[PDB]
CSV table of all heavy atoms in Angstrom, one decimal:
chain,number,residue,atom,x,y,z
A,312,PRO,N,-10.4,0.2,18.8
A,312,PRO,CA,-10.6,0.1,20.3
A,312,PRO,C,-9.3,0.7,21.0
A,312,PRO,O,-8.3,0.7,20.3
A,312,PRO,CB,-10.7,-1.4,20.5
A,312,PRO,CG,-9.9,-2.0,19.4
A,312,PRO,CD,-10.3,-1.1,18.3
A,313,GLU,N,-9.4,1.0,22.3
A,313,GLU,CA,-8.2,1.5,22.9
A,313,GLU,C,-7.2,0.4,22.9
A,313,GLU,O,-7.6,-0.7,23.0
A,313,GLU,CB,-8.6,1.9,24.4
A,313,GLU,CG,-9.2,3.3,24.5
A,313,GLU,CD,-8.9,4.0,25.8
A,313,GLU,OE1,-7.9,3.7,26.4
A,313,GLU,OE2,-9.8,4.8,26.2
A,314,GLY,N,-5.9,0.7,22.8
A,314,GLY,CA,-4.9,-0.4,22.8
A,314,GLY,C,-3.7,0.0,22.1
A,314,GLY,O,-3.2,1.2,22.0
A,315,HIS,N,-3.0,-1.0,21.5
A,315,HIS,CA,-1.8,-0.7,20.8
A,315,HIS,C,-1.9,-1.1,19.3
A,315,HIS,O,-2.6,-2.1,19.0
A,315,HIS,CB,-0.5,-1.3,21.5
A,315,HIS,CG,-0.1,-0.5,22.6
A,315,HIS,ND1,-0.8,-0.3,23.8
A,315,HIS,CD2,1.0,0.3,22.7
A,315,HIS,CE1,-0.2,0.5,24.5
A,315,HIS,NE2,0.8,1.0,23.9
A,316,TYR,N,-1.3,-0.2,18.5
A,316,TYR,CA,-1.3,-0.4,17.1
A,316,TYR,C,0.1,-0.5,16.5
A,316,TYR,O,1.0,-0.3,17.3
A,316,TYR,CB,-2.1,0.7,16.5
A,316,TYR,CG,-3.5,0.6,16.9
A,316,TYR,CD1,-4.1,1.2,17.9
A,316,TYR,CD2,-4.3,-0.4,16.2
A,316,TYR,CE1,-5.4,1.0,18.3
A,316,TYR,CE2,-5.7,-0.6,16.6
A,316,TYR,CZ,-6.2,0.1,17.6
A,316,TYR,OH,-7.4,-0.2,18.1
A,317,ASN,N,0.2,-0.8,15.3
A,317,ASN,CA,1.5,-1.0,14.6
A,317,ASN,C,1.7,0.1,13.6
A,317,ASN,O,0.8,0.6,13.1
A,317,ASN,CB,1.5,-2.3,13.9
A,317,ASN,CG,1.0,-3.5,14.7
A,317,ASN,OD1,1.5,-3.9,15.7
A,317,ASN,ND2,-0.2,-4.0,14.2
A,321,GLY,N,7.5,1.0,15.1
A,321,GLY,CA,6.9,0.3,16.2
A,321,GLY,C,5.5,0.6,16.7
A,321,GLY,O,4.5,0.5,16.0
A,322,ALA,N,5.4,0.8,18.0
A,322,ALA,CA,4.1,1.0,18.6
A,322,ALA,C,3.5,2.4,18.5
A,322,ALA,O,4.2,3.3,18.3
A,322,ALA,CB,4.1,0.5,20.1
A,349,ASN,N,-3.5,-5.5,14.2
A,349,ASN,CA,-2.8,-6.8,14.1
A,349,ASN,C,-3.3,-7.7,13.1
A,349,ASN,O,-2.8,-8.8,12.7
A,349,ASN,CB,-2.8,-7.6,15.4
A,349,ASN,CG,-1.6,-7.2,16.3
A,349,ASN,OD1,-1.4,-6.0,16.7
A,349,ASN,ND2,-0.8,-8.2,16.6
A,350,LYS,N,-4.5,-7.3,12.4
A,350,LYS,CA,-5.1,-8.0,11.3
A,350,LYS,C,-4.8,-7.5,10.0
A,350,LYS,O,-5.2,-7.9,8.9
A,350,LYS,CB,-6.6,-8.1,11.6
A,350,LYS,CG,-7.0,-9.2,12.5
A,350,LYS,CD,-8.5,-9.2,12.8
A,350,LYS,CE,-9.0,-8.2,13.9
A,350,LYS,NZ,-8.5,-6.8,13.6
B,367,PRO,N,-1.1,-13.1,16.5
B,367,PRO,CA,-0.4,-12.6,15.3
B,367,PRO,C,0.6,-11.6,15.6
B,367,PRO,O,0.5,-11.0,16.6
B,367,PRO,CB,-1.6,-12.0,14.5
B,367,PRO,CG,-2.4,-11.4,15.6
B,367,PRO,CD,-2.4,-12.5,16.6
B,368,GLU,N,1.5,-11.5,14.8
B,368,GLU,CA,2.7,-10.5,14.9
B,368,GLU,C,2.0,-9.2,15.1
B,368,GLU,O,1.0,-8.9,14.4
B,368,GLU,CB,3.6,-10.6,13.8
B,368,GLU,CG,4.6,-11.7,13.7
B,368,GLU,CD,5.9,-11.3,13.0
B,368,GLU,OE1,6.3,-10.1,13.0
B,368,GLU,OE2,6.6,-12.3,12.6
B,369,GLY,N,2.6,-8.4,15.9
B,369,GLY,CA,2.0,-7.0,16.1
B,369,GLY,C,2.3,-6.4,17.5
B,369,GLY,O,3.3,-6.7,18.2
B,370,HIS,N,1.4,-5.6,17.9
B,370,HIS,CA,1.5,-5.1,19.3
B,370,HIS,C,0.5,-5.5,20.2
B,370,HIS,O,-0.7,-5.6,19.8
B,370,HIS,CB,1.7,-3.6,19.3
B,370,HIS,CG,3.1,-3.3,18.9
B,370,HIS,ND1,3.6,-3.4,17.6
B,370,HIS,CD2,4.1,-2.8,19.7
B,370,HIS,CE1,4.9,-3.1,17.5
B,370,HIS,NE2,5.3,-2.7,18.8
B,371,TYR,N,0.9,-5.7,21.4
B,371,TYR,CA,0.0,-6.1,22.5
B,371,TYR,C,0.0,-5.1,23.7
B,371,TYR,O,0.7,-4.1,23.6
B,371,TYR,CB,0.4,-7.5,22.9
B,371,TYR,CG,0.0,-8.5,21.9
B,371,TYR,CD1,0.9,-8.9,20.9
B,371,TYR,CD2,-1.3,-8.9,21.7
B,371,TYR,CE1,0.6,-9.6,19.8
B,371,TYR,CE2,-1.7,-9.7,20.6
B,371,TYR,CZ,-0.8,-10.0,19.7
B,371,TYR,OH,-1.2,-10.7,18.6
B,372,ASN,N,-0.9,-5.3,24.6
B,372,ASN,CA,-1.0,-4.3,25.7
B,372,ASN,C,-0.6,-5.1,27.0
B,372,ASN,O,-0.8,-6.2,27.1
B,372,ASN,CB,-2.4,-3.9,25.9
B,372,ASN,CG,-3.0,-3.6,24.6
B,372,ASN,OD1,-2.6,-2.6,23.9
B,372,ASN,ND2,-4.0,-4.4,24.2
B,376,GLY,N,2.6,-0.4,29.2
B,376,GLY,CA,2.4,-0.2,27.8
B,376,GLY,C,2.5,-1.2,26.8
B,376,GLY,O,1.8,-2.2,26.9
B,377,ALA,N,3.3,-1.0,25.8
B,377,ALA,CA,3.4,-2.0,24.7
B,377,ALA,C,4.2,-3.1,24.9
B,377,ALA,O,5.1,-3.1,25.8
B,377,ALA,CB,3.6,-1.3,23.3
B,404,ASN,N,-6.2,-6.3,21.8
B,404,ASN,CA,-7.2,-5.1,22.0
B,404,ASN,C,-8.6,-5.4,22.3
B,404,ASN,O,-9.4,-4.6,22.5
B,404,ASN,CB,-7.1,-4.2,20.7
B,404,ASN,CG,-6.0,-3.3,20.8
B,404,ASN,OD1,-4.8,-3.5,21.1
B,404,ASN,ND2,-6.4,-1.9,20.8
B,405,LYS,N,-8.9,-6.8,22.2
B,405,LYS,CA,-10.3,-7.3,22.5
B,405,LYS,C,-10.4,-7.9,24.0
B,405,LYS,O,-11.3,-8.4,24.4
B,405,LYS,CB,-10.7,-8.3,21.5
B,405,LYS,CG,-11.2,-7.7,20.2
B,405,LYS,CD,-11.5,-8.9,19.2
B,405,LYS,CE,-10.2,-9.4,18.6
B,405,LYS,NZ,-9.1,-9.9,19.4
Side-chain angles (χ1 to χ4, degrees):
Chain A
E313 281 209 27
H315 281 68
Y316 293 97
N317 317 291
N349 273 60
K350 280 178 275 58
Chain B
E368 281 207 23
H370 283 73
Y371 292 93
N372 319 294
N404 273 56
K405 279 178 283 51

